[PDB]
Structures are given as structure tokens and as C-alpha cells.
Design a protein around this ligand. Structure first.
Ligand SMILES: *[C@@H]1O[C@H](CO)[C@@H](O)[C@H](O)[C@H]1NC(C)=O
Ligand SMILES: *[C@@H]1O[C@H](CO)[C@@H](O)[C@H](O)[C@H]1NC(C)=O
Ligand SMILES: *[C@@H]1O[C@H](CO)[C@@H](O)[C@H](O)[C@H]1NC(C)=O
Lengths: 103, 107, 228, 109
């Protein structure tokens, strides 16, 4: 019954709307605004590099809502990890999101 | 978000197998019995060798990449197996369920 | 003696894509067998003119001439002249009609709350402001089906008070109150030369507009770190 | 709302419909004193598409976008020879709609 007005998946806002069918009275209807932001509370500054301070601000302008906080479940985020095993250093691509993407 | 609640009957001798969808990318596929009192979800069957303490040795996992149905089977029914069994994927269990369905005892 | 010539208008090139110069000569003496011609600036002739009207009720003859040219023959700045002759003045009377920037946005204002309380008719208004030059078009579509001018009207194009750069026009639609229990979204489509596709369809229904109740439901979790 | 996010101007429209005969007059008052004729524009009456013998008009007042932002009434006054006192007026504010009750549901669990 609710039209999916916004289904943002990178800041996770899920704004929507509907018209509430009131009684058979004059049209003093109500329009709904079910905004539903979910706070990660444990992610980093860049979403793709776990070395920055964690997260203080959470800015949500709903006009730029149609850098991110959360991780897209169908997207893959990776990085270069500098391992060595002795003298050589094979900088190899790691996975910051094991299971959203496979090699 | 599929909700195919089926009325498959069960008994001690009786065996009921649930059907679930698979992404087939070898992620963590699980069946989980939701607890009404706890308000969370407790994995009864997982991709790993974990099995619930109550369900030890009486459950079987059956995966077909060919037909795109992920199905689990229960050997014996004690008649207490009535709850929201939801399937799913991802590491997470609660917030990752794909489809839910409640099985039933007797009929 | 009355002679005029009109260029094509934007209400025909978008509706039919049949751009054509017209020449209307009437209120002359009642004498047939007249010649009408259209001449360009280069020396290219035109196609034949037909569909002449009958004599006027006040005892005078009319005459219409058509110059069917290509689409780019009017947007490339070619002057056209209408040759019309008469039995009394031996010189061929001729008339010259010539040439015509900002792109301005549509805005659809929903009917006010006071008008809806009368339960008679809500009027939707479509404002096309900041557009230059004139002759900007407008059409209403209900559920993607074209809306005729029987049920809608447009302000003949106009001018702005502080800036003389672009001019404004307006359009208002009429309906019932039972219609605004289902909506049908009453899209307002426009057609102006300063547009990519000559279309800037906008629509507003009861679902959009000013809402009367917001419930933000922001949740905070320590494990919802990948917004599934 | 779409027009106010451009942060340039605000456009208030006084819609005068359902009068008869023609020759209706419109002015734009603000805190008692009128506005200059170069601030508002009035269109000529045109017949109603459904109603046989009635008309309509319009009166656009364009102001700076910031000026709308702080209260500021802009009441439109209409004079027609069929009104009970020959003068009527309407007004809007930034605050002229409804209650718009927020219903916040902050969650920390
Ligand atoms: C940290 O953020 C920057 C800014 O976008 C970006 O390069 C990346 O996500 C992080 N930096 C590195 C070196 O990974
Ligand atoms: C928002 O309000 C609507 C009706 O006003 C209600 O159905 C909905 O559950 C509310 N949202 C939340 C998150 O409670
Ligand atoms: C919003 O209001 C509705 C009714 O006005 C209420 O049912 C709902 O619970 C509210 N949303 C909350 C408290 O999140």
C-alpha cells in the first residue's frame, strides 16, 4: 500500500509515503513520511579502509538521498594488504566484506 | 521476502523437509528457528557442521545446484517442532533471512 | 483591402510537424482569378495553395495562400515574401514576415485546501516561468492519455516584472472532488524550443505535496554495518 | 517546494475564479501598505472552460526567496462589484498549512 519513494542503500535511508484512508468524512486526509535511517555505529570514515577514526557524524540530507556509512550487500569492497613472509612483499588484494563477492 | 507458510504434517516416524532458495555462491546458507520469547533467531542448521543441541543427529541438509531449491529434512518429529523456520544467507542469522515458514505437527 | 502573413506556430510543429507559412488576403474587391505566390530570399519556389474560403457575409472575397517548406527552412533564418495582386493596383503587393535565450522550468501547484472543501471542482495550475522566447506549449495528460482544451486552458504567453529576460505563461485544469479521491496524477506536459526532447513532463498527486505527519524511525544497531 | 530549493525567488499566485461579469481588480498588500505595480502582474479575464458565463484571472507576485522565509504575509486583495462589501482579501504565511506533527521513534536497542 506504500509507494517506495526512496530505497537508498548506501546511506540506508528508506523514505516512503502513503495516504491514510480515514473515515468517509471531508478530505482531511494524512500523508505519511516513514523515513527510516539505520545507524551503523561501528563503521569507518572511508567505508573501504579500516585505518581511520570510527564515526561521529551522521548527516542525512533527504534531497541528496534519492562518502557512505554502510556496505552494499551486493557490492564488493576490497583492499591491498601488505603481507611479506620474509623478504619479498606480495601486496595482495584482501576482502573487507567476505561473502558479498567472491573471486 | 517470501512467506510460503505450508502445513506439512509431522510425527515421530514422520519426516518433513523444508525448501529454500540458494544464491549458489557458496556463502553461509542456514535454516533458523525464531524464538518468540527471545525475540531473536537461533540457527538450527548451518553451512558448517553445527547442529542444534535438541536436533543432534536427526536433521539432514540436502543441496541441489541443479534445480535451485535448498532443502533440509527432519527425520523424527517430537511434535514440539512448531515455529518460524526461516532460511537465508550471509554470515548474519537474524537479519539475513530470505524466506520464512512455519511447519506443523499431526497434519 | 486587407493583407497579412503569419509564420508557423509552435502549437502545430509539435502537434503535427507541418510547419508552413500562411498568407491571408481579404476585404478586397469582389474579383476572382487572382494569383498568390511565396518567394524566398534565395529564389526557391513553393508548393501550390488551395482550400480557399467562400465569400464573406459582408460582400467581399477572401484568399488564402500556403508556403509548405522544410523544417530547417524556418530555423535557419530565411525571409519569405507573399506576392498578392489585385485588379485595381497594378503593382504586386508584397509582405515580409521574419524571425524570433533562456530555458525556464515548469512548476505545478496543487489546488488549495479551501477550494477542496467546497466539494465542487479543484483546479490544478501549471506555471511555465523563465522561458524565452514566447509561444511555449502545454498539454495535460490523465493516466498517459491526452487531455483536450475543452477541459483545460492556458494563459496566453506573458512578461516578467523585475527581469525582462524571460516571459511567463500559465495553465489551469478543472475537475471534480471525487476525482481527488483517486488522483490519476494529472501530468502537465510542456513543449518549448529550449528543451532537449521538447518535453519536461511533471506531475503531482495527493501522495506528494505537503504531508501532515512525519515519523522518522532512525534505529541504531551495533551490527547493521552493511545496510542490507 | 521545488521552486524554493533553487534559492532565487518565491512566486505567490492569487487565483480569482468564478466571478461575473468581467473587470475585476487585484492589489497586493503587505502590512497595510500596497506593493508597487512592478512587483506583481495581473492577467486579463478569460472564460471558464465548463461554466458558460463566468471568468477567471490570476495575479502573480514574485519576491526574493529569502524574504518568504521569515513570516511575511503578502495578502492579496480583490475588488469586484459582486462581493458583499466590494472588497475581499486572502493571506498566506510560511506557516500557513497545517500542524505537521512529527512522530519521532528514536531507537537505541
Ligand atoms: C580512505 O578514504 C579515501 C577517500 O575516498 C579513499 O581513498 C579510501 O576509501 C581510503 N584510502 C585508502 C588509501 O584506502
Ligand atoms: C508511522 O505512522 C504510520 C501511521 O501514521 C504507522 O502505520 C507506522 O507504523 C509508523 N512508523 C513506525 C516506524 O512506527
Ligand atoms: C505515529 O503515529 C501513529 C498514529 O498517529 C502511531 O500509531 C505510531 O505508533 C507512531 N509512530 C511511532 C510512535 O513511531
Amino acid at each position: 500500500e506504500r509507494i517506495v519513494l526512496v530505497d537508498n542503500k548506501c546511506k540506508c535511508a528508506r523514505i516512503t509515503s502513503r495516504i491514510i484512508r480515514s473515515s468517509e468524512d471531508p478530505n482531511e486526509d494524512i500523508v505519511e513520511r516513514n523515513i527510516r535511517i539505520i545507524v551503523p555505529l561501528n563503521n569507518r570514515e572511508n567505508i573501504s579502509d579500516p585505518t581511520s577514526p570510527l564515526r561521529t557524524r551522521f548527516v542525512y540530507h533527504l534531497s541528496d538521498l534519492c562518502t557512505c556509512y554502510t556496505y552494499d550487500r551486493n557490492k564488493c569492497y576490497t583492499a591491498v594488504v601488505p603481507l611479506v613472509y620474509g623478504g619479498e612483499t606480495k601486496m595482495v588484494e584482501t576482502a573487507l566484506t567476505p561473502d558479498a563477492c567472491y573471486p | 521476502r517470501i512467506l510460503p507458510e505450508v502445513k506439512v504434517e509431522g510425527e515421530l516416524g514422520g519426516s518433513v523437509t523444508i525448501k529454500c532458495p540458494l544464491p549458489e555462491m557458496h556463502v553461509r546458507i542456514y535454516l533458523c528457528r525464531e524464538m518468540a520469547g527471545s525475540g531473536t533467531c537461533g540457527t538450527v542448521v548451518s553451512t558448517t557442521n553445527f547442529i542444534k543441541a535438541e536436533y543432534k543427529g536427526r536433521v539432514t541438509l540436502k543441496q541441489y545446484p541443479r534445480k535451485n531449491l535448498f532443502l533440509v529434512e527432519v527425520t523424527q518429529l517430537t511434535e514440539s517442532d512448531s515455529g518460524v523456520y526461516a532460511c537465508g544467507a550471509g554470515m548474519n542469522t537474524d537479519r539475513g533471512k530470505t524466506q520464512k515458514v512455519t511447519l506443523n505437527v499431526h497434519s | 483591402i486587407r493583407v497579412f502573413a503569419i509564420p508557423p506556430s509552435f502549437a502545430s510543429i509539435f502537434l503535427t510537424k507541418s510547419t508552413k507559412l500562411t498568407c491571408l488576403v481579404t476585404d478586397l474587391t469582389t474579383y476572382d482569378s487572382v494569383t498568390i505566390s511565396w518567394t524566398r530570399q534565395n529564389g526557391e519556389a513553393v508548393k501550390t495553395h488551395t482550400n480557399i474560403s467562400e465569400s464573406h457575409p459582408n460582400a467581399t472575397f477572401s484568399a488564402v495562400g500556403e508556403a509548405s517548406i522544410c523544417e530547417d527552412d524556418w530555423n535557419s533564418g530565411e525571409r519569405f515574401t507573399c506576392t498578392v495582386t489585385h485588379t485595381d493596383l497594378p503593382s504586386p503587393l508584397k509582405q515580409t514576415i521574419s524571425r524570433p535565450l533562456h530555458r525556464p522550468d515548469v512548476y505545478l501547484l496543487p489546488p488549495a485546501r479551501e477550494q477542496l472543501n467546497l466539494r465542487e471542482s479543484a483546479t490544478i495550475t501549471c506555471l511555465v516561468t523563465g522561458f524565452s522566447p514566447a509561444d511555449v506549449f502545454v498539454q495535460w495528460m490523465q493516466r498517459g492519455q491526452p487531455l483536450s482544451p475543452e477541459k483545460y486552458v492556458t494563459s496566453a504567453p506573458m512578461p516578467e516584472p523585475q527581469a525582462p529576460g524571460r516571459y511567463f505563461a500559465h495553465s489551469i485544469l478543472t475537475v471534480s472532488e471525487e476525482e481527488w479521491n483517486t488522483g490519476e496524477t494529472y501530468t502537465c506536459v510542456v513543449a518549448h524550443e529550449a528543451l532537449p526532447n521538447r518535453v519536461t513532463e511533471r506531475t503531482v498527486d495527493k501522495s506528494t505535496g505537503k504531508p501532515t505527519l512525519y515519523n522518522v524511525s532512525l534505529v541504531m544497531s551495533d551490527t547493521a554495518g552493511t545496510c542490507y
